[PDB]
Amino acid sequence: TYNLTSDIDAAAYLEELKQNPIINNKIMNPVGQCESLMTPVSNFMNEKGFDNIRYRGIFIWDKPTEEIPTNHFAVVGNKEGKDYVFDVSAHQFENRGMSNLNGPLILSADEWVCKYRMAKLIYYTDFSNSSIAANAYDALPRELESESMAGKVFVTSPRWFNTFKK
């Protein structure tokens, strides 16, 4: 399967993003970049005629006792009644036990979820503001057992977490 949907001109959009030398370097070297890419990717999408732009804050938990979960960020937008996710730094995880995330993704929302599932406990929340997203899905210590799952959307629900929660 694929990283770039044909439902929209994702291949063209990726090339256009990569014509920007700063974005090109961040796609070549994505580790630590998802947060800084939110604003530029949103601007890009808006100018392409996507609307209802949201900022997707994500956690990836390996185990219940992890002190700081792994975070990630993507941008979601509507085009003609369907949501698409631009996640051009997904491949920051290629070398961290998610080898299937082997390039930038521009996918429908359902394809995006599918991609992460085929690649740990993963959940997200969409926000209207990128700094709100960043704050809610930050890199400070958090205890999974006492996190509110209110407003969390599960991508995965591993057996360990269902057992953990009881």
Numbering used by the authors: 145 to 263, 267 to 313
Show me the paper's own sentences about this structure.
SseI is secreted into host cells by Salmonella and contributes to the establishment of systemic infections. The C-terminal domain (∼140–322) of SseI contains its catalytic function and shows some sequence similarity (19% identity over a 88-amino-acid stretch) to Pasteurella multocida toxin (PMT or ToxA), which causes atrophic rhinitis in swine. Based on its structural matches, SseI is a member of a particular subgroup (clan CA) of the cysteine protease superfamily.
In this work, we were able to determine the domain organization of SseI and obtain a crystal structure of its catalytic C-­terminal domain (reductively methylated; residues 137–322) by SAD to 1.70 Å resolution. No density was observed for 12 residues at the N-terminus (137–144 and four vector-encoded residues), nine residues at the C-­terminus (314–322) or for residues 264–266 (a presumed disordered loop). The SeMet protein was purified using 10 mM DTT instead of 2 mM DTT to prevent Se oxidation, which may explain why it did not crystallize as a disulfide-linked dimer under these reducing conditions. It might also be the reason why seeding was not required to obtain large diffracting crystals of the SeMet protein. The higher resolution SeMet-derivative structure was used for all subsequent structural analyses. The measured Cys-to-His (3.5 Å) and His-to-Asp (2.8 and 3.4 Å) bond distances fit well to those expected for this type of catalytic triad. There is no room in this cavity for additional molecules and there are no other cavities from the surface that lead towards the active-site residues, making it likely that a small molecule such as water is involved in the catalytic mechanism of SseI. Looking at the region surrounding the active site, it is not obvious what type of substrate would be likely to bind, as there is both a positively charged and a negatively charged region on opposite sides of the solvent-accessible Cys178.
